[PDB]
Design a binder for this molecule. Structure first.
Ligand code: MGC
Ligand code: MGC
Ligand code: MGC
Ligand code: MGC
Lengths: 133, 15, 15, 133, 15, 133, 133, 15
């Protein structure tokens, strides 16, 4: 897949992703906060189409992500991120995608997710997150 | 809150 | 170097 | 003066300031690095004119600021930043302005200046810096 | 306050 | 269980834990590095005995933990940490305990684990980790 | 002089230094906070004696240093730290030593001093500080 | 490496 790396920012305002309930996560795009101003991150798209878009608008700055969880599995022989769930201090968004495979979760006691990086081919191959105080 | 913070030194000049 | 760094956890998914 | 606060970024690429060899520092503007991309910061200007512009282009990323020094003094009854000097790992830029008053300096053993904030009226009243690893 | 803080991830296990 | 929280340090030198291949993780104790000197952390012990001790001596400073994984499950009606695995840049230690339940893993691209906190009753109820650059 | 470097800690509880109102700063020793526990740092002493001791007990954790200032000068042909002043959010301690030479100051808007390093011969040659959130 | 680092400002005094 094609790798991407948004880098680090001040916070997260909105997340736009797409998925397919038979396959896995497709497109990924984030609207970060850059020192009080919205910063529209690059839209990382799947090599293919046919996904269902989802917009996660957070009530920045009072609302922030506290946990990220999901499932990683096999699709057409490739290991990818099949499902994703975002739990904030106000609500739970997801799960999105197929909840099958091996689970993973990242709870945060102190700190903030300030950036995303990963790879996307037909689906989201993998991803990592930037953490800060 | 949801705003990232960092160390800040200063100010220098008018108080 | 002159590039600021921050903690990064992951990846999750394909190795 | 009018306060400003650029916030934090990935690094510093270029600094544009102006001064008057009789008075103090006037305008201040920085071109930061945002995750590998140049980010043009807002130009904070003096309420008045008649300053001499100076452009400090750093050889980012190999060249970074290691020390910032300057003088603070009295001008027309106001305490302001009369002089500024930027020493990088490759060269020394300055002093700019009037080297008179009380001196101040910030040497950095480990870390980077990633942002500026301060205030500007007829001159640079004061300023602070964001530090990070 | 005067206590230094750092990032903390978790918990894993009992809720 | 009895909660514990070691706080943050400069690094990790040695980890001493015990487990039971039928139940879960028992005792937990860490020897941290405090600015170049070994610091013997408090030994957090299980309310019960009968575990198998394990010593994980890391080749500090060249060897460090890159990923922590394990399983959380049900034991006698309590949700606990049943298994733990520590993967460094030189070797893989574990799994220790019972590899059944729901899996979790923390891979680290940039940063270090500098502290542990959690709770221990008859077994390790839960735990969290301090991350730093 | 003999260099020293205490490393970084959780905070500062008490500072013990000595000075001579005709020369400069002599001995330097700090009692840091290590995750809620007092940690007695090594006492870095002057090659000579005849200084006046001073104990700065901070009301940890509610009281912390906000600014450190002082003077560097020439003594017997050596450039050293002749004076030191510690301003907390509750009180001002100092100046201690001789207030002559070139001044320096470190005001902190956000962050904490968590460690000291420097060098001491007959007097405090120089020093640096660890900063953290 | 496996040693945690933090920001350090200085030195002040002898060059
Ligand atoms: C059909 O394969 C493609 O999609 C995979 C899955 O998300 C992977 O991303 C895989 O690398 C990518 N191959 C290329 C050449 O981009
Ligand atoms: C003549 O005064 C002005 O300039 C001063 C100096 O830089 C100060 O910035 C001072 O605050 C500002 N006054 C106002 C109202 O902006
Ligand atoms: C038999 O129960 C005990 O052990 C559990 C499991 O590790 C839990 O730790 C549980 O809380 C603890 N009870 C007390 C009072 O500490
Ligand atoms: C008389 O000199 C000594 O003291 C100086 C001043 O504090 C300097 O510390 C100087 O280096 C030290 N000499 C040695 C060998 O440590």
């Amino acid at each position: 897949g094609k790798a991407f790396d948004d880098g680090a920012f001040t916070g997260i305002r909105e997340i736009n992703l797409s998925y397919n309930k038979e396959t896995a996560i497709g497109d990924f795009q984030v609207v970060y906060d850059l020192n009080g101003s919205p910063y529209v991150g690059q839209n990382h798209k799947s090599f293919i189409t046919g996904f269902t878009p989802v917009k996660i608008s957070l009530d920045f700055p009072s609302e922030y992500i506290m946990e990220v969880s999901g499932y990683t599995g096999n699709v057409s022989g490739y290991v990818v991120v099949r499902s994703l769930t975002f739990k904030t201090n106000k609500k739970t968004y997801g799960p999105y995608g197929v909840t099958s495979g091996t689970p993973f979760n990242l709870p945060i006691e102190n700190g903030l997710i300030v950036g995303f990086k990963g790879s996307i081919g037909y689906w989201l191959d993998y991803f990592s997150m930037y953490l800060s105080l | 809150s949801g705003k990232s913070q960092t160390v800040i030194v200063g100010p220098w000049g008018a108080k």
